GROMACS .gro file of N, CA and C in nm:
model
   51
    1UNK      N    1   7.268  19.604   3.279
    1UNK     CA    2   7.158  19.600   3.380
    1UNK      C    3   7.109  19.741   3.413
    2UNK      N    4   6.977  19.773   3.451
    2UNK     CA    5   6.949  19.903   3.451
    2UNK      C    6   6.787  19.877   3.564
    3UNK      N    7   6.815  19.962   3.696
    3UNK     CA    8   6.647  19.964   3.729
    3UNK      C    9   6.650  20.081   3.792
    4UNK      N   10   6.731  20.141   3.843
    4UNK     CA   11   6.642  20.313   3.870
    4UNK      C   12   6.723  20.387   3.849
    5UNK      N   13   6.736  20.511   3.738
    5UNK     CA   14   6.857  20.554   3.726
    5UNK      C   15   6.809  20.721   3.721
    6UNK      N   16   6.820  20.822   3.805
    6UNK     CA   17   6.805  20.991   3.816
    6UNK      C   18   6.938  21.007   3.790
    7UNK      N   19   6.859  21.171   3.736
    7UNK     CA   20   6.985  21.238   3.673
    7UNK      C   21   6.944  21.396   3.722
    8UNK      N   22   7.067  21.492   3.722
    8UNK     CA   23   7.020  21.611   3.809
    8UNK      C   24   7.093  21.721   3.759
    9UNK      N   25   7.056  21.869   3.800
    9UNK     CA   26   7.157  21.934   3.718
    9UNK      C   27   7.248  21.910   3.651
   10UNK      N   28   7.411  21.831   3.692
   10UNK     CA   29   7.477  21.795   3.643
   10UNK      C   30   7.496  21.665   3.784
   11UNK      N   31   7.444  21.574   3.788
   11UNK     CA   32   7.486  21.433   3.866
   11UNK      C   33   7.326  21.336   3.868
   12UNK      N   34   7.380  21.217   3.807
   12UNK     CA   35   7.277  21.125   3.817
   12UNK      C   36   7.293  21.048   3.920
   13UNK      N   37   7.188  20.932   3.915
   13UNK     CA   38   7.216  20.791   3.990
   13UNK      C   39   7.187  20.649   3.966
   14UNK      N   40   7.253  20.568   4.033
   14UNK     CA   41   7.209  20.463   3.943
   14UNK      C   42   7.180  20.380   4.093
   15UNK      N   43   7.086  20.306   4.111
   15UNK     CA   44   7.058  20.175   4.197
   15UNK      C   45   6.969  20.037   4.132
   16UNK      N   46   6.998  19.958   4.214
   16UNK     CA   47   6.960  19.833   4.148
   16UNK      C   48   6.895  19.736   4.258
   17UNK      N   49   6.714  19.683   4.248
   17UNK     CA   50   6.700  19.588   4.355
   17UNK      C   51   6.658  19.482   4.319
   0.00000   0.00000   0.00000
């Protein structure tokens, strides 16, 4: 499953709605 996923220097993110 995948719907908003940032990524950053070194740390991403993941959320889901």
């Amino acid at each position: 499953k995948w719907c908003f996923r940032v990524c950053y220097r070194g740390i991403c993110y993941r959320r889901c709605r």
